[PDB]
Amino acid sequence: AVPISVPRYKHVEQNGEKFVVYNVYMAGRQLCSKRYREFAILHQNLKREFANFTFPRLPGKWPFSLSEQQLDARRRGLEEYLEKVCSIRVIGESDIMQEFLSES
Structure with a gap:
């Protein structure tokens, strides 16, 4: 497992x-800050x-x-x-994921 977190x-x-927004870190370094709907789009794009x-299923809507508490659960998910x-290297290194894990 790569050291990706959403702390x-x-x-x-x-x-x-x-x-x-959910703040995404790799090896303790912040990569991006993104709302749930951007994760939903990432999921669609990756699939x-x-x-x-x-x-795997993305955490869902309610x-x-x-x-x-549910925001915290969504973060964990x-x-x-x-x-x-x-x-998974091909996914982790994809242009899609590399774009997602960055700041405009």
């Missing part, structure tokens, strides 16, 4: 919208590019607004997802 989530404000793999997919 923090944060409530942010930007362009007038309030939302949550289409790596069409012959069967990907029928209600998330509590703090996103970390578990990244631990799995990033530990």
Whole structure:
């Protein structure tokens, strides 16, 4: 397993919208800060590019607004997802993942 982690989530404000971002680290160094919907897009993109793999489930949506505890659970689930997919070299090194794990 590669040393990928998502040790923090944060409530942010930007362009007038309030939302949550998840801060992704590799070997203790921060790579990106991204909202859940960007992870959902990453998942779709990876599945289409790596069409012959069967990907693990991304943490899912809920029928209600998330509590703090659920934000923390979502964070943990996103970390578990990244631990799995990033530990596969062709996926971990893909242009898709390298773009995701960076700041514009």
